[PDB]
Structure formats: structure tokens, C-alpha cells
Design a protein around this motif. Structure first.
Motif, PDB file in Angstrom:
ATOM      1  N   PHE A 184       0.867  -1.016  -0.026  1.00 20.36           N
ATOM      2  CA  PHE A 184       0.029  -0.089   0.157  1.00 20.36           C
ATOM      3  C   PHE A 184       0.978   1.089  -0.004  1.00 20.36           C
ATOM      4  O   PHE A 184       1.788   1.293   0.764  1.00 20.36           O
ATOM      5  CB  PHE A 184      -0.852   0.124   1.240  1.00 20.36           C
ATOM      6  N   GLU A 185       0.718   2.224  -0.958  1.00 16.32           N
ATOM      7  CA  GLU A 185       1.532   3.398  -1.157  1.00 16.32           C
ATOM      8  C   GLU A 185       0.989   4.258  -1.597  1.00 16.32           C
ATOM      9  O   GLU A 185       0.232   4.303  -2.589  1.00 16.32           O
ATOM     10  CB  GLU A 185       2.910   2.820  -1.862  1.00 16.32           C
ATOM     11  N   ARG A 186       1.386   5.674  -1.161  1.00 18.10           N
ATOM     12  CA  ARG A 186       1.037   6.875  -1.753  1.00 18.10           C
ATOM     13  C   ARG A 186       2.234   7.712  -1.628  1.00 18.10           C
ATOM     14  O   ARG A 186       3.009   7.783  -0.477  1.00 18.10           O
ATOM     15  CB  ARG A 186       0.086   7.661  -0.751  1.00 18.10           C
ATOM     16  N   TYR A 241       3.735  11.755  -2.043  1.00 15.49           N
ATOM     17  CA  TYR A 241       3.366  12.880  -1.962  1.00 15.49           C
ATOM     18  C   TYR A 241       3.904  13.812  -3.329  1.00 15.49           C
ATOM     19  O   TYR A 241       5.346  13.510  -3.267  1.00 15.49           O
ATOM     20  CB  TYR A 241       3.244  13.610  -0.537  1.00 15.49           C
ATOM     21  N   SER A 277       4.052   7.530   2.289  1.00 10.96           N
ATOM     22  CA  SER A 277       3.001   6.370   2.889  1.00 10.96           C
ATOM     23  C   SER A 277       3.357   5.185   2.313  1.00 10.96           C
ATOM     24  O   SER A 277       3.167   4.924   1.224  1.00 10.96           O
ATOM     25  CB  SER A 277       1.775   6.966   3.159  1.00 10.96           C
ATOM     26  N   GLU A 283      -0.492   5.837  10.408  1.00  8.41           N
ATOM     27  CA  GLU A 283      -0.301   6.059   9.003  1.00  8.41           C
ATOM     28  C   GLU A 283      -1.820   6.984   8.778  1.00  8.41           C
ATOM     29  O   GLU A 283      -1.411   7.899   8.196  1.00  8.41           O
ATOM     30  CB  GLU A 283      -0.579   4.616   8.082  1.00  8.41           C
ATOM     31  N   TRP A 338      -0.872  10.751   7.638  1.00  7.85           N
ATOM     32  CA  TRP A 338      -1.675  11.318   6.337  1.00  7.85           C
ATOM     33  C   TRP A 338      -2.722  12.327   6.759  1.00  7.85           C
ATOM     34  O   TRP A 338      -2.413  13.519   5.853  1.00  7.85           O
ATOM     35  CB  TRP A 338      -2.331   9.979   5.723  1.00  7.85           C
ATOM     36  N   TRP A 339      -3.394  12.320   7.610  1.00  7.13           N
ATOM     37  CA  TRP A 339      -4.383  13.550   7.937  1.00  7.13           C
ATOM     38  C   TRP A 339      -3.564  14.958   8.203  1.00  7.13           C
ATOM     39  O   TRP A 339      -3.929  15.845   7.670  1.00  7.13           O
ATOM     40  CB  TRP A 339      -5.130  13.129   9.101  1.00  7.13           C
TER      41      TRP A 339
END
Ligand SMILES: Cc1cc2nc3c(=O)[nH]c(=O)nc-3n(C[C@H](O)[C@H](O)[C@H](O)COP(=O)(O)OP(=O)(O)OC[C@H]3O[C@@H](n4cnc5c(N)ncnc54)[C@H](O)[C@@H]3O)c2cc1C
Ligand SMILES: Cc1cc2nc3c(=O)[nH]c(=O)nc-3n(C[C@H](O)[C@H](O)[C@H](O)COP(=O)(O)OP(=O)(O)OC[C@H]3O[C@@H](n4cnc5c(N)ncnc54)[C@H](O)[C@@H]3O)c2cc1C
Ligand SMILES: [Br-]
Ligand SMILES: [Br-]
Ligand SMILES: [Br-]
Ligand SMILES: [Br-]
Ligand SMILES: [Br-]
Ligand SMILES: [Br-]
Lengths: 394, 394
Positions: free
Chosen positions: A177-179, A181, A270, A340, A344-345
């Protein structure tokens, strides 16, 4: 060569795990790719949670931290021309965070390990992992030309994001799972007194800025910067001019600037893998997950992975309860996902995103106004910032 | 024809404003495009906040509601095979919400207005607004062929999203914030007893579902559906089969189904205009802002706009403090933005979005797990759901 637990990586995760294990009588060997000095040169974390602080005390390596670390009871968030303080201690029910540099923590652990005489092999080149699902896994590495073999019962991959351990698990066995930025953090370490006694996170139209510290005479500042930036394009003065522009006037006025001791760009990401283990290989720290720095969770999450791994290995060795090791991932992932989510928030409410429409900009501002003005909202930030409780196991 | 306040729209906003005004001695005329029966046929809101309930009592139109409305102390949210109850009353410090249909509220106000003899012109065709910035604005409309003119001091646009009042403000004077969601709600009203005593919001992999009610023998259900859907493609049985599939088994088992009394698709949207006034024209309700139904805020926000407008008009007429009317927008917008933020948050955590990656799906699930498992998290939902306090003015 033979040991009980082979540890890949001599960063904080591997060192803390090895220290806890050594103190409990479980022999372990740490293999590091770089030199002691290289690891020590990494300027990273500055904020530690209570759980990390207690773990360091358990490992008996807290003397220097207790003396030099700064205990913070609050943090500030500035946005739309106003500064709001979140009383962490009050809203979390008495918990605080401690500012003590990662280079310091690492130095303390390295000194502690050397005195105990536990095995550490630096410049262990080309580490390879074998027989992960067998009864007797082993590690091969190169020390000045000759390939050596290390036999062990278990392997703990504490080699960070670019380590070999995560790459050693058959890809089909993992869910990633990856994001990524669209920005990074330009950080600058200076031997100047901090502008404030507590940290200041700032959401500004020009971009995010953060005022942090390492001691009464050493500061750490960051400014959001796009991914196209090269560190050589940012002179010390350009950084200070940009930093000052993103802070409230009364803060920028009393800012003591100076030459940089270190300057670097960190990309924000992330990342989580499930599961965090494979056979006799267990991942911990950055090897298993990455969080954007906004919530100061990375090193703190590594501490809980390690705390969990150590406790399970203790059960396995001292009590013959090896079956408990199968619960490692389930246990860690519960905490990892919540941290996480928090990171992220924090990231989405404090940074300026490039492809943002009017509605989203307003929602961002309102998120801040709501969470910083509601007692319930403040408490959600505070309990997450100081760190959620560790799961006890079994 | 002459009056003090001209009101465009005889939906709940216009009716409530006119009733409050009439009771205080401020003459007003309401102009409605449709017939009384058409307005009454609209099945909309089912959930009312305390502020709306008190406003109805102030307008002296709460007899039927006090008798027939259901007071709810909690709501349920189902996700990933588990049902979690949010004790609104406990977590909000004693507030609750009331279930009483919008058709009922409207009927009550219409009956109240007719008995008082206040002026209401139905089928007022082609309403046009003139001289908004003058001292004496006026409205022109058509009643059976002849164009009539109504002179007034102020005009309150309570004509909903597609009304004429918002279109009457020079476009350059307005900033529009809007987000259109890639889905709508398929709702079904049935004369069957509800499946639960409290509402159930459900996040399911197939899509969002909501179990609501109107009374002990009338239920209202919704299921998320893409924008391509036509209501004629959904027979009553297809709806029930789909609804049952999105609910936990123990809930679907005791579900009493039946023929639909009303069935319709509502598209989801967030919309806000700034400012909410222009000269002697003041916007209120759906004419100024729209929220996706997930947070049950629409009608409740209209009530606070109206409460604010009424109070300011009272000051203007009774105390000669006309200058206070300039603060209308600033006052309303503070509350509107927080409710917009809440509705957007509820929507993003309960619905299934089409272009969603693995990381986002996990973050969505974690948002739920965190907010539903933390006392602080639960309190942020609860205080927002029951409704944030109204600003007192001045
Ligand atoms: C800008 C920034 C700010 C941060 N701020 C904070 C903060 O305030 N609070 C907090 O909690 N966290 C923070 N962190 C996160 C924290 O620094 C990390 O989570 C932490 O460094 C993880 O430690 P680790 O031991 O798991 O891995 P690392 O520190 O990456 O160490 C891993 C080690 O393994 C070694 N290695 C790699 N590959 C091999 C190999 N093939 N063979 C042998 N050895 C190998 C490496 O050489 C390295 O020494 C921050 C990070 C950044 C970048
Ligand atoms: C599926 C759904 C569920 C909802 N659930 C809830 C809930 O549980 N709780 C809650 O708080 N809110 C809820 N609402 C929102 C709520 O129904 C609305 O916010 C509310 O109807 C707004 O009332 P209003 O008087 O401002 O406008 P409207 O109800 O739209 O009435 C406006 C009136 O003005 C008239 N008009 C329009 N144009 C003209 C013109 N040119 N000249 C003259 N008259 C004109 C119309 O004919 C209409 O009668 C829901 C809405 C939907 C669609
Ligand atoms: Br450091
Ligand atoms: Br971090
Ligand atoms: Br945490
Ligand atoms: Br209704
Ligand atoms: Br609504
Ligand atoms: Br509200």
C-alpha cells in the motif's frame, strides 16, 4: 559463525532490538552495510513518544536522554494568521513527547552495545538471506573479499526502506500500500537557539514550514518544497528568507539565523506491506512501513515493532512458546495503520497541494478551524500525537 | 401591492421565516412557483437537530411534532462486518435528534400560516427581482396572465437550489465553491415498520446503504447508486435485494419489506456561495448552500440561516438597527462551513468511490476504526451530528 538472532541493519531499530535481546540473554549479531560514522551522520528524528522513551529505559540506555532530552507539553499550529497551541499533556491525560535527536539515540545504543561486547559487523557487503522457511535459515555476507556464512534461528530485517530483507520475500506473498506525495521537506540544521520553546507547525499559502529543535542551542527547520528542487539551489540565505516568509511576523522577527550544519531534501511517502514476516524473517521499522514526517511517527512505530518482536522472541526462547511469533504482523499492523492514518491526516491539513480547487482549500482551512477549536477535536490530535497505547500481546 | 418582507419560496425555509416574522408583527408575503400539493409531495428530510426543534417551538408550530416525532439518542454505523453505536446523548453532553418528516413540518407550517391569514401566493409565475440596491426593491410575478408588482423593504430568497434569487445577484459579486460526487442516493419510502429503532448507516463493499424511518409504521431506505442509473431500472424487489445485500445478515433477516410509496434518485453535491446577500436580498437555505445528505444537515442549516435572518430583521424593524443586517453572511458562513466539512467527512468515509487505490481503501477503513473506537473520535462525530451551537449575534 552461529548466533540465535541475526539482525540486518544497525540503525535505531536493529540496535534497540539487539540491546533488549542481549540484556535478556538472547545472543544476536548485527550486520550493517555502512560504517559507524555514516549511520551517525544521518540527521533524522527529533521527536520521541513516551513509549520509545520507556523502551530506551528498559534497554538501560537512557542516562544521556534523561539529562539532555527536552520534555515538551505542547505544540503550536499556525494557519491563516493565527497561532493555536495544543496542550498535549492536558488533552492526552498527562502524556508528553521528548525532543532528543536520532543521532544521539543511535550514539547511545552504539556505545551501549560496544561495552557489552555484542557482535556488530560493519561494512558487511552484499548481505543475502537463505532458507527463510527452513528450520535453520542463514545469512551470507562479504567482509573484505571473503564470503562468510552466519547461521541463526531467526532473522530480523531492520534495514530500512532500501534494505535487502523486504526484497527477500517472494513478491506474490506481499500486498503493498503506497502513496507518494507531490512534495518533499527541505531541512536545515543550525547551531542557533530555537525561535520557540515548543514546535511550530505552519500552514502557509506559500507552503508548509516547521520550526523544531535539538537542544537549547541547536535548531531544525523544514520548508515544503516541490520534487523538482535540488538542494544545491538552496543557499542558507534563500532558506532563511523563505522560512521567514512562511511564519507569522512576530515569530520571524525573533528568529536567530545562522550557517547550516546540514541541509537535505526528504521526499514524503506513506508505505505499508502486509504481512511483515515470512517464515523466520520478521520486518521491523522502515523496512516494513514509511510515514510522512508530519506526525513524527516513524521512529516511534519502529520502537513498537521492536518492542513487539522482542517480547515474542522472549516467549519463544525462554518459554518455548514459538507459536506466538505467528501473531507478530497482526499485532503490529493494528498500530501501524492508525499511525499511518494520523500522519496522512496531519500531512493533508498542513501542506499546500498543487492541483487544489476552491472547495478543497476551504475544507482544509475548516478542518483546521474545527479541530483546533473543539475540545474533542484537540483531543484527537493530542492522543495521536503523544502516541496510542501499545498492545500487550496474548 | 406592498409588504415589509417579500419571501420567494414556500418550502420550509420561507414558511418558517414567514411564521416567525408574522408572530413578531413584521408583515411578509410568500411567493411560490408551484402548488401547495406539489411542495407537500416532496419526500426529503427525516432528521431534525435540537436547534430546528426549538425554532419550531418558537414559531408556535410544534404540537404535532412533540406528539408524533421520534426522539433518537443514538445512531449506528456498520462497516467491515461490525455494528458500532454512537451514543449521541452521552457523547454530546445530553443532546439528541428528532425524526419527523419534512412533509410533516411543511404541513404544520402551511396550516399555521393559513390560520393566521398571512399572505401566500401559489403559482406565482416568472418571479423577477428589481432594484436590489435601491431603497425600495420590488418583485414582479404573474398570476393567471397579469403581471403584478409587489413593493417591499427586503427580499428573502428561500427558493432552493434552482431558484431565481441566487441568479439575480451579479455573478461577479459571488464566489462559488462546489464539489459534485460521482454517485447519488436511491431512496424508497415504504409503509413498513423500520428494521431498527435507531438509524443505521452502512459502509459496504457494494456501496453505501442507510436504514431510516418516518414513524413506527413508515420507513425510508437509501442505497448508493452511480449517476448513470434511472429510477425506472429499479423495481421494488431489485431495491430490497440490493438493500439486503449491503446490510449485516442479522439486520437483513428481520427486515420487513413492502411496496414503495415513493422512489427517487438524489444526486450528491456540496455547494456554498459567498456572500449570501446582495443589497436588500438575503439568501437562506438551499438557495445559498447544499450539503450531501450523509450528515442530515441541509434543513438544519436552513433553520439557522432563518433564525439569524429573523433576529437581524427584528433588530432592524423594532430597534432601528438596520446596520446589523450587513453581518448576516459572516454569521451564517461560520456555521455553514463547519457543517459542510462534517457532511463531506461523513460522505467520504461511508461511500465507495470508483477511482480508489489500495492505500485509500485502507485509510477509509482505518478512519472508521479510529473514530468509532476512540472516545475523542466518537465525540467529534456526536457533537457535529447533533448540531453545533448557533452564534448569538452582536
Ligand atoms: C525528515 C525526517 C524526519 C523524521 N522525523 C522523525 C521524528 O521526529 N520522529 C519519529 O518518530 N520519526 C521520525 N523520522 C523517521 C525515522 O527517522 C525513521 O523511521 C527511522 O530512521 C527508522 O529506523 P530504522 O532502524 O528502522 O531504519 P534506518 O534508520 O533506515 O536504518 C536502517 C539501517 O539498515 C542499513 N542497511 C540498509 N540496507 C542494508 C543491507 N542491505 N545490509 C545491511 N544493512 C543495511 C542502513 O545502512 C541503515 O543503517 C523522520 C524521518 C525523516 C526522513
Ligand atoms: C435525499 C435528501 C435527504 C435529506 N435529508 C435531510 C435530513 O434528514 N435532515 C436535514 O437537515 N436535511 C435533509 N435534507 C435537506 C433538506 O431537504 C433541504 O435542505 C431543504 O428542503 C431546504 O429547504 P428550503 O426551503 O431552503 O428549500 P426547498 O425545500 O427547495 O424549497 C424551496 C421552494 O422554493 C420554490 N421555488 C423555486 N424556485 C422558485 C421561483 N423561481 N419562484 C418562486 N418559488 C420558487 C420551490 O418551488 C420550493 O417550494 C435532505 C435532502 C435530500 C434531497
Ligand atoms: Br538527529
Ligand atoms: Br516520521
Ligand atoms: Br500511535
Ligand atoms: Br419527508
Ligand atoms: Br442533508
Ligand atoms: Br452544525
Amino acid at each position: 559463525m552461529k548466533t540465535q538472532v541475526a539482525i540486518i541493519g544497525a540503525g535505531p531499530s536493529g540496535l534497540l532490538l539487539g540491546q533488549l535481546l542481549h540484556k535478556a540473554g538472547i545472543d544476536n549479531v548485527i550486520l550493517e552495510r555502512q560504517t559507524p560514522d555514516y549511520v551517525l551522520g544521518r540527521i533524522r528524528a527529533g521527536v520521541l513518544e513516551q513509549g520509545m522513551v520507556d523502551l530506551l529505559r528498559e534497554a538501560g540506555v537512557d542516562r544521556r536522554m534523561a539529562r539532555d532530552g527536552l520534555v515538551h507539553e505542547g505544540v503550536e499550529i499556525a494557519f491563516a494568521g493565527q497561532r493555536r497551541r495544543i496542550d498535549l499533556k492536558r488533552l492526552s491525560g498527562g502524556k508528553t513527547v521528548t525532543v532528543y535527536g536520532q543521532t544521539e539515540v543511535t550514539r547511545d545504543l552504539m556505545e551501549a552495545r560496544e561495552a557489552c561486547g555484542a557482535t556488530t559487523v560493519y561494512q558487511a557487503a552484499e548481505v543475502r538471506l537463505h532458507d527463510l522457511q527452513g528450520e535453520r535459515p542463514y545469512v551470507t555476507f562479504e567482509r573484505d573479499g571473503e564470503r562468510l556464512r552466519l547461521d541463526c534461528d531467526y532473522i530480523a530485517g531492520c534495514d530500512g526502506f532500501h534494505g535487502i530483507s523486504r526484497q527477500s520475500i517472494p513478491a506474490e506473498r506481499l500486498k503493498v500500500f503506497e502513496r507518494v506525495y507531490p512534495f518533499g521537506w527541505l531541512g536545515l540544521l543550525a547551531d542557533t537557539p530555537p525561535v520557540s520553546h515548543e514546535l511550530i507547525y505552519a500552514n502557509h499559502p506559500r507552503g508548509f514550514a516547521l520550526c523544531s529543535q535539538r537542544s537549547a542551542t541547536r535548531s531544525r527547520y523544514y520548508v515544503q518544497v516541490p520534487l523538482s528542487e535540488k538542494v544545491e539551489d538552496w543557499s542558507d540565505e534563500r532558506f532563511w528568507t523563505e522560512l521567514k516568509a512562511r511564519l507569522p511576523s512576530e515569530v520571524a522577527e525573533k528568529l536567530v539565523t545562522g550557517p547550516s550544519l546540514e541541509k537535505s531534501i526528504a521526499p514524503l511517502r506513506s508505505f505499508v506491506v502486509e504481512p511483515m514476516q515470512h517464515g523466520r524473517l520478521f520486518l521491523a521499522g522502515d523496512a516494513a512501513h514509511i510515514v510522512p514526517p508530519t506526525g513524527a511517527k516513524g521512529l516511534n512505530l519502529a520502537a513498537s515493532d521492536v518492542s513487539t518482536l522482542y517480547r515474542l522472541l522472549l516467549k519463544a526462547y525462554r518459554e518455548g512458546r514459538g507459536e506466538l511469533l505467528e501473531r507478530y504482523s497482526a499485532i503490529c499492523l493494528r498500530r501501524i495503520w492508525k499511525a499511518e492514518r494520523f500522519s496522512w491526516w496531519m500531512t493533508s491539513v498542513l501542506h499546500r497541494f498543487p492541483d487544489t480547487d476552491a472547495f478543497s482549500q476551504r475544507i482544509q482551512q475548516t478542518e483546521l478551524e474545527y479541530y483546533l477549536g473543539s475540545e474533542a477535536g484537540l483531543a484527537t490530535i493530542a492522543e495521536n500525537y503523544v502516541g496510542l497505547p501499545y498492545e500487550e500481546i496474548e
